[PDB]
Structures are given as structure tokens and as C-alpha cells.
Design a protein around this nucleic acid. Structure first.
Lengths: 412, 555
DNA sequence: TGGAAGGCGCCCGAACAGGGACTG
DNA sequence: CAGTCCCTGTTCGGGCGCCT
């Protein structure tokens, strides 16, 4: 019935070949059933070892969901389709979405199942379901329709999407609507009732057009930034002043107006760490002038659409986690802190997973991009546990760092 | 016209590349008679055809005599064809483990006979298979044939076989949901909770179903007879075990000997608990050739002795019962070696194993324990699809202190303390705050890049001081060395100010073992202290006595 | 004799790959 | 600043084990 939009790989790039990782029984069961029904419906179909390509697959449950969802880690595929979705059929990003009083996220991925996929492309959607204890060899499939979580999918379906939306846009001129992958982000300044109401409306529109919504609520105008603060103490020790100076020293990599000289003077001699020393007038002055500079905005920091977002996360203890999103070192587009997330005081990995998802979400609402993460964890630790906590339908890029804290710059 | 058995699998060559051309090995008439023999057989069965000059491709074939068997084994070496053959996605993701099998009333083990040879090759690929057939030495140029089926030794054979076989078995399984079939290569493990009669019946049904596809099940099958020989194991009704493991007694020890020995001990460690390979492998470090012969150290001999003793006793694994919880318990074996047992009923082991890996130049017992837990978790998920409940030689409070204070995200899944010395502890703790009434040591060290000569020393709030010349050293080593001096020359409580990020980074992670003797000595001293507070200040800021040790150790 | 495939595990060492301090 | 050095982590390739 439909005509398939052809698709090619980025110039000179082979398809994905990524080994499937072990899955828990609950997950393998959910996948075997999901996939069975999808085959009955022609959405995927079985293939064989002739196809050299493979992408990892697993299952998740969205927050509060209780229903298994299939998730493909298409990160490699997407990196290899990148020009198609960025350059050609891609999506303009509304700078007002971050300003809306409320933004709801809806799963529209089902819709992508309508459209056929270019026949010559499918060989690249290959995935293998594994078996407990290697009883059976891998059951290999490939997608016959637009796969959920592929970047090409929301591109190819864009015309159809706006087609379905145009009534609602005319009806409500002010509501903002963004599409990122399997998700639709809907913002408004209406009070909560009006809001949820109108989202139900949009649900109906999607339903009569051939799609279903099995969304999260966000409040961006409430999103906070985490400034660099200096302590206020009534009396200072040599140690206090040493910590202060090392902090101000690190800070000057960011605000160059910071000065350590009057303060370093108090550290002139070889003194006991716990020894109290009073602040000179010049030191008091330099200090307050410094506290002022740290109120000011950093200079010459603006988002550049052609550059990747990098996100760094630090574990502050006691359930606190600080992060910074940046493109160039020391020019931070955003800084934040999270406390008391699920897993607080009990599970570091769960908290980190939560933090990665929150940060990525803000990145989508703000710049319409996901950041590359620098994760304070051992590769094997993260890799063993992360999919247990993953509640989201996208997967960001990441690398692993080990960065002891000589200074705590980002949290008092 | 030849006939067609079962659906074929499209194959290809790496684009813009062509079939193999190479001539053979000079061969004894032994091998050649062992060849032309089974050569002339297949022609009738349909497993080969003949080609004229039209077929510009040449590959070698020579035979190897079957292990523990009568007839000879024919293997074609396709290595130059393999190199040019398309890559496949392997469907074989790992080896099944006896410990992952459930209890089954009735159990059968069948082999598909001449399995590779019962599967149709791809039409248009057949040509590329071409080899040359010897009459005998000096006799004749020979006759050249092509496979109509999957050759032993190609690189696409296992994947296509395993995949096809799955396709065939799938309907039998959809009709018989309760029968269990472990399919590994051409080996089949069928098991059921049926009564042994209805079971033999269903096995027959299955042999006939495999027949419809031209897959033969000879009588080399094990019928009712435990123990079944499966995947290198013996399966009895309620237990399983590794087939006997013969360890070499060689009086003279070479390198390749140590290798075969260790490999075998590793294999044994899945069931015999407590195996230790550390000292033995120490012998293999930076050796010249596999042939070189080295003597056993006292340390290696002691280990090999207790491993042979471990191996004296017979042991057996049990099977897996989903109704029961999975449990893994770990013991610290010393020198960074760890052993574990996974079981369900106390003392009846599903399997055992070891984790010996050393990660990093500097580490501690808590980190290595974490590593073991992860190794075990992943292994458990592969086999049972779930994570064991853990029993660990580490106080709950030790662990709470470590994970909460560490700067990395770290976690262990649900676990409980088992008090089974040696316990895992943190050997010293750095203060979070400067110590009132303790001598403050401002420490520094620097080296000359050229001379690789340097100094390390300190200055104190009490006027105490030291400097020491060092030869053939680095900035890093001297920063460590300044800290070491401050530790040696100070009492039970000390404050130490350093500008070394490197040094601080190592010590704050509370290592108990290092690849570096200097770090080891620093550790030794840290363990002897009551209170140690390390602090960092930036260099060249002329901070404190830190400009004055900065100007002291350059002198 | 010396010799093929694929899979998974271990242990080593050599290579690459990257961060942070010192130096032209 | 670019270019070295240290150093410490990762990845890869090659050996052995074991299965078919």
C-alpha cells in the first residue's frame, strides 16, 4: 500500500555488528512473546546467519509501567545512518519548549510500525534473541517496518506526523510540540487540568489516525542551575584557607577574574593545619570580590548546534549528584545537582542511571540533542547493572572516567 | 537432475573477490588410500559432483585419523576460501552448562549422522568448493569434485547448519511444548517428564521428523543409559560430573606443559572447589618460546600439590531447581585469588569457580571482591537467567563505609555476611578533617628530567625537616617518596600537605596492595598510623611551607 | 607426520589511547 | 601554546583448555 523511502548508510560505512549481551529470564520471556506477536503481524521476520549484521536488544518498563517494552540499542546503527536524519529529513527544534510551564512526554513509537521500511535497508535491523543456558542458538530477526528507536524512523514518518497534527496546531496555536525519536514532547502554559485535558485530546487525534499512547510530566521553567559557592565561616584555619585557595584556583579556569594572592599571603609560613588565622583586610576584600565574580555569568558561552554535548557527573555522597553540560571545557551551558532519587542511600548504580536519564531529558527539551556522558563508574560495574534500571526509550552515548576529587568544586 | 532436500541459504564472496586456487600437500599413499576410499562413496549419495576445466578453482584436502575411532576423518583446509568468504553472524552464543539443566524424568542423547553432509549447500556457491582428488603418488593428475553440501572445514558450515537445524526442530517443539531439546551443533539432548515409554515413543516421532528432512539418527544414541556423555560431562539421574581429568606428572617441566596443566586446572575449577592457578602462571611471564623448559618454584610446587589433592576426591554437581533460590558464596584465597560456590541446597553445588584477575597497579580487597561478584553475576545470568543471592566475607559495615565514601558509583546486589575468615576489610581510613595537635608535614619532591636525579623531603610546623637525594627517579616517585618520609618520621597521628594529585589519587582509594614497592611501604606505614589526614594544595602558589619545601627540594 | 571450522573460558604481553605536569 | 615524559587503563592477538 505505502511507498518506502529509500535509505543509505553514511558514506563508506559498514552496518552494525554488535554482540548481544546475556539477558535475564524475565526479559528473554517478554522478548520471545513480544517478537512472536510482531512476526504474526509482519513487523519483523526471521532471517539467518547469511546476514552479517547484529544489534543488541533487551526489554524495559517505563516508570510505573508494569508492561514490558522492547528496546533496541541502535546507537551503532544510528551513528551509521547519521547524515540521513540530521541533514535530510530532520526535525527543527523549538526554543520555546524549555520555556513552557509544562511539558508532557508521550510514546508514539507505535505509529512507526505503519510505514514499510526500504527493503534494501532491513538487512541492517538484524537482532538476535538469546536463550537461557544456550539451550537453543540465537533466534535472528529483522524489521520489515520502521523500528522503534531508530533515528531514521521519526524522520521518515515526519510528513505523516505533521499531517496528523495540523488540526491540533490550528486548534491550539500556542501549544508547542517537539519530536525526539519515539517521543512526542508537548508543552503549554495552561494550568495542569487544562493541560492533561488537551493531552487527552491529542491522544484522541492520534488514535483515530492509527496510533496508540500507553506520558511523563516535566516542568522546565522550574529547572534549576547549580552555582559555585564559597563557604561562609566566622573563623578560618590554615586548612580552611588552603581548601578555599585550591577551590578559587580551580574556579579561575572558568571565571578568570578570580584572584588568590591576598589569601595565599595568609598561608605564607609552615603552620599547623588546625591553627586559626584571621583574615587581613586585603584578603577579606579579595574574598568578597571573588564571591561577586561567582554571581556573574561566564563570558562567551553559548550553544553551538554543530558541536556535541558532553555531560559530566560527580558523586557527592549522601545521595547528592552534581553535573555539568558543556561543549567546550569550562564553558558550561548548564550545571545542576540531583538529590534523593530512587536508590538514594542504597544503590549508586540506580541513582546514576536515574541521573543519566534526567540529564538526557533536559538536553532534549533544551537543545533537542542527547549528551555524551562521562560516567564516574567502572565499565564492568555499569555494564552489568544498567539495563536493570533503564526506564527510557532512547540510549545516550557514554564513556567511563576515574577522577578523584582533590577539590570539591561543584558541591560545598 | 539431482534432487533437493530442505531450504537453502544464500551465500556470497566478499565483494569483488574470487574463488581459491592452490595445489596440495605431498602426501603418503597412506593418506591417499584413506582418501579415494570415501571419495568414491559420496558420488552416489549426492554429496559431490564432478567438474571439467570449466571450473578454475583449486584447494587442498588431507585426512586425520578419528580420535578413539575406527575409520579415518576427511577434512578439507579452506583457509584461503575462508579469508575470501563473506562474514557470518554466528548464532552460537556460548556453551550450555550441566548445572543449568533441570531435573528430568526421561532423557535421551542423539547425534545427527554425517550432519554437515545432510545439508544442501547453496546452488551458485557450489563451484567455489573445488578440490583435487589424488589417485596415488606419481599415479595420475587425479579427478576434481565439488560439494553439493556443507564441507567440514569451511567457515559458513557451523552457522548454516545450526540455523537450518533450528528451523527444522522448531515445528516439532511447537507441537511438543513440554519436551526439552538442547541443540548444540549436531548433538541433541531431549528430555521430558513423560514416563520412559511415552518418551521412547516421542523420541521415535522426533527421529522420523528429522528423517522427513533427510537427517539421520543412527544408533550411537544413548537410549536409557545413564550416565549420558554430553558436552564433556556425565549426566546421571540426580547428579552430573566432569569426565575424568588427567593431569600430567612430567618430571621435567616445559612452558607448553605448564600451559596444558593450567588449562586443565581451569576446566576442573567449574566443579572441584579451591583450585589455584596463580603461582603456576607466574612461571609463564615473558618466556622465550613455548618449547623452553623451566623448573617449578617452591611456591608453584606447593600449589600444584594441593590442586592434585583437591583432585584426589571425586566430586559431582547437581541440577537446577527453579523453585529454589540461587546462592553464591565467595572465599578469599590470598594473593588476589578468589573462589566461589553456587548452590541451592546447602553443600550440594551447582557449580564452582574462581576469579584471580588483578586489575590496576593499585588495588584492594573490596574492589577485587566487587569484581568477583560481577563475574559471578554475569555467569549466573548466562546459565540460569538470574542473579544469585550472595554470601560474602565482608562485614556489612565495612562495605557501607567503602561504597558510601568512594568517589565512583559502586554496588553489590542483595547479599549477606558470612563469617568465614579471612574477612575482607579496609586496612586504614583517611581522616575527613585535619587533626588537632598533630604535626603538620608539608611535603615535596621533584626530579630532573635529564639527570633523572631528584629530591624528596618535608618541613614541619615544629621546625622538623628533612631532605633526601634520590637517583634515577621521576617526579611521581619523588612525590610518593616525600609522603613516605613524612609517614616514617611522624608519630601515630599526622597531617600531611602535598601538592601531588597523582599521590593523593592513589592513597585516597585506600589500596592494600600495589605493583609498586614504594606504594606498598606507604601502605605499611598507613596501616601503622592511628590518624592520617592528607590534604592537597596547588603548587607554585607559594602556599605555606609548601613554597618552602618547594624551595627546599630543588636546592 | 606438520596440517580444518566455529563457539566459550583463562593468562600473558605488546600496542594503543588518553590525562596531567613539565618544558621548549 | 605544541611536544615530550610518566603513568595507568583498555584492547587485541596469541597460547592453552573444553565442545561439536
Amino acid at each position: 500500500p505505502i511507498e518506502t523511502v529509500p535509505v543509505k548508510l553514511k558514506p563508506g560505512m559498514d552496518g552494525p555488528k554488535v554482540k548481544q549481551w546475556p539477558l535475564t529470564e524475565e526479559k528473554i520471556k517478554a522478548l520471545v512473546e513480544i517478537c512472536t506477536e510482531m512476526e504474526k503481524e509482519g513487523k519483523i521476520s526471521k532471517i539467518g546467519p547469511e546476514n552479517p549484521y547484529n544489534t543488541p536488544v533487551f526489554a524495559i518498563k517505563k516508570k510505573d509501567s508494569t508492561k514490558w517494552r522492547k528496546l533496541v540499542d541502535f546507537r551503532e546503527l544510528n551513528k551509521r545512518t547519521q547524515d540521513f536524519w540530521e541533514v535530510q529529513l530532520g526535525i527543527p527544534h523549538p526554543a520555546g519548549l524549555k520555556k513552557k510551564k509544562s511539558v508532557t512526554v508521550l510514546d508514539v513509537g507505535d505509529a512507526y510500525f505503519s510505514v514499510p521500511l526500504d527493503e534494501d535497508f532491513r538487512k541492517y535491523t538484524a537482532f538476535t534473541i538469546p536463550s537461557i543456558n544456550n539451550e537453543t542458538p540465537g533466534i535472528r530477526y529483522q524489521y520489515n517496518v520502521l523500528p522503534q528507536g531508530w533515528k531514521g524512523s521519526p524522520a521518515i514518518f515526519q510528513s505523516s506526523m505533521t499531517k496528523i497534527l495540523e488540526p491540533f496546531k490550528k486548534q491550539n496555536p500556542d501549544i508547542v510540540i517537539y519530536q525526539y525519536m519515539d517521543d512526542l514532547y508537548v508543552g503549554s502554559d495552561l494550568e495542569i487540568g487544562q493541560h492533561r485535558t488537551k493531552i487527552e485530546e491529542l491522544r484522541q487525534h492520534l488514535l483515530r489516525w492509527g496510533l496508540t499512547t500507553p506520558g511523563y510530566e516535566l516542568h522546565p521553567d522550574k529547572w534549576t542551575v547549580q552555582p559555585i559557592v564559597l563557604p561562609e565561616k566566622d573563623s578560618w584555619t590554615v586548612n580552611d584557607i588552603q581548601k578555599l585557595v585550591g577551590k578559587l584556583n580551580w574556579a579561575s579556569q572558568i571565571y578568570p577574574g578570580i584572584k588568590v594572592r591576598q589569601l595565599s599571603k595568609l598561608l605564607r609560613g609552615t603552620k599547623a593545619l588546625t591553627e586559626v588565622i584571621p583574615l587581613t583586610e586585603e584578603a577579606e576584600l579579595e574574598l568578597a570580590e571573588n564571591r561577586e565574580i561567582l554571581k556573574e555569568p561566564v563570558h562567551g558561552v553559548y550553544y553551538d548546534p554543530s558541536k556535541d554535548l558532553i555531560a559530566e557527573i560527580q558523586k557527592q555522597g549522601q545521595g547528592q549528584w552534581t553535573y555539568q553540560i558543556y561543549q567546550e571545557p569550562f564553558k558550561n551551558l548548564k550545571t545542576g545537582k540531583y538529590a534523593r532519587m530512587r536508590g538514594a542511600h542504597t544503590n549508586d548504580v540506580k541513582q546514576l542511571t536515574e541521573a543519566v536519564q534526567k540529564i538526557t531529558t533536559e538536553s532534549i527539551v533544551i537543545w533537542g540533542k542527547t549528551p555524551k556522558f562521562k560516567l564516574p563508574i567502572q565499565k564492568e560495574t555499569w555494564e552489568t547493572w544498567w539495563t536493570e534500571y533503564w526506564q527510557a526509550t532512547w540510549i545516550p552515548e557514554w564513556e567511563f572516567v576515574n577522577t578523584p576529587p582533590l577539590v570539591k568544586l561543584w558541591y560545598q | 537432475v539431482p534432487i533437493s532436500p530442505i531450504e537453502t541459504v544464500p551465500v556470497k564472496l566478499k565483494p569483488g573477490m574470487d574463488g581459491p586456487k592452490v595445489k596440495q600437500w605431498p602426501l603418503t599413499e597412506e593418506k591417499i588410500k584413506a582418501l579415494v576410499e570415501i571419495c568414491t562413496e559420496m558420488e552416489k549419495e549426492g554429496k559431490i559432483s564432478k567438474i571439467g576445466p570449466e571450473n578454475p578453482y583449486n584447494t587442498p584436502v588431507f585426512a586425520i585419523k578419528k580420535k578413539d575411532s575406527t575409520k579415518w576423518r576427511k577434512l578439507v583446509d579452506f583457509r584461503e576460501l575462508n579469508k575470501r568468504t563473506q562474514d557470518f553472524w554466528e548464532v552460537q552464543l556460548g556453551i550450555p552448562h550441566p548445572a543449568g539443566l533441570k531435573k528430568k524424568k526421561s532423557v535421551t542423547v542423539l547425534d545427527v549422522g554425517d550432519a554437515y553432509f545432510s545439508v544442501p549447500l547453496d546452488e551458485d556457491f557450489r563451484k567455489y568448493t573445488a578440490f583435487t582428488i589424488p589417485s596415488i603418488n606419481n599415479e595420475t593428475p587425479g579427478i576434481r569434485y565439488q560439494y553439493n553440501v556443507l564441507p567440514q572445514g569451511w567457515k559458513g558450515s557451523p552457522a548454516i547448519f545450526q540455523s537450518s537445524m533450528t528451523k527444522i526442530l522448531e515445528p516439532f517443539k511447537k507441537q511438543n511444548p513440554d519436551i526439552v531439546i538442547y541443540q548444540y551443533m549436531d548433538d541433541l539432548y531431549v528430555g521430558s517428564d513423560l514416563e520412559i515409554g511415552q518418551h521412547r515413543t516421542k523420541i521415535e516421532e522426533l527421529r522420523q521428523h528429522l528423517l522427513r528432512w533427510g537427517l539421520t539418527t543412527p544408533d550411537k544414541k544413548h537410549q536409557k543409559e545413564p550416565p549420558f556423555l554430553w558436552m564433556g560431562y556425565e549426566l546421571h539421574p540426580d547428579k552430573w560430573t566432569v569426565q575424568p581429568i588427567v593431569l600430567p606428572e612430567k618430571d621435567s617441566w616445559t612452558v607448553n606443559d605448564i600451559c596444558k596443566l593450567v588449562g586443565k586446572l581451569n576446566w576442573a575449577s567449574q566443579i572441584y572447589p579451591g583450585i589455584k592457578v596463580r603461582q603456576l602462571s607466574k612461571l609463564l611471564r615473558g618466556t622465550k618460546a613455548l618449547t623452553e623448559v623451566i623448573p617449578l618454584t617452591e611456591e608453584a610446587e606447593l600449589e600444584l600439590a594441593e590442586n592434585r589433592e583437591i583432585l584426589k576426591e571425586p566430586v559431582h554437581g547437581v541440577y537446577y531447581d527453579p523453585s529454589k533460590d540461587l546462592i553464591a558464596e565467595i572465599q578469599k584465597q590470598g594473593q588476589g585469588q578468589w573462589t566461589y560456590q553456587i548452590y541451592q541446597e546447602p553443600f550440594k553445588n551447582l557449580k564452582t569457580g574462581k576469579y584471580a584477575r588483578m586489575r590496576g597497579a593499585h588495588t584492594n580487597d573490596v574492589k577485587q571482591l566487587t569484581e568477583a561478584v560481577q563475574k559471578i553475576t554475569t555467569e549466573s545470568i548466562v546459565i540460569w537467567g538470574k542473579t544469585p543471592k550472595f554470601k560474602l566475607p565482608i562485614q556489612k559495615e565495612t562495605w557501607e563505609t567503602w561504597w558510601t565514601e568512594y568517589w565512583q558509583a559502586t554496588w553489590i546486589p542483595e547479599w549477606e555476611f558470612v563469617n568465614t575468615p579471612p574477612l575482607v576489610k579496609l586496612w586504614y581510613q583517611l581522616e575527613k578533617e585535619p587533626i588537632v595537635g598533630a604535626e603538620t608535614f608539608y611535603v615535596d619532591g621533584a626530579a630532573n628530567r635529564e639527570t633523572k636525579l631528584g629530591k624528596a623531603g618535608y618541613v614541619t610546623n615544629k621546625g622538623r625537616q628533612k631532605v633526601v637525594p634520590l637517583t634515577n627517579t621521576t617526579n611521581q616517585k619523588t612525590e610518593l617518596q616525600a609522603i613516605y618520609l613524612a609517614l616514617q618520621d611522624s608519630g601515630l597521628e599526622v597531617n600531611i600537605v602535598t601538592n601531588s594529585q597523582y599521590a593523593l589519587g592513589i592513597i585516597q582509594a585506600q589500596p592494600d596492595k600495589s605493583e609498586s614497592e614504594l606504594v606498598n611501604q606507604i601502605i605499611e606505614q598507613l596501616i601503622k598510623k592511628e590518624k592520617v589526614y592528607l590534604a592537597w594544595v596547588p603548587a607554585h602558589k607559594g602556599i605555606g611551607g609548601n613554597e618552602q619545601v618547594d624551595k627546599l627540594v630543588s636546592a
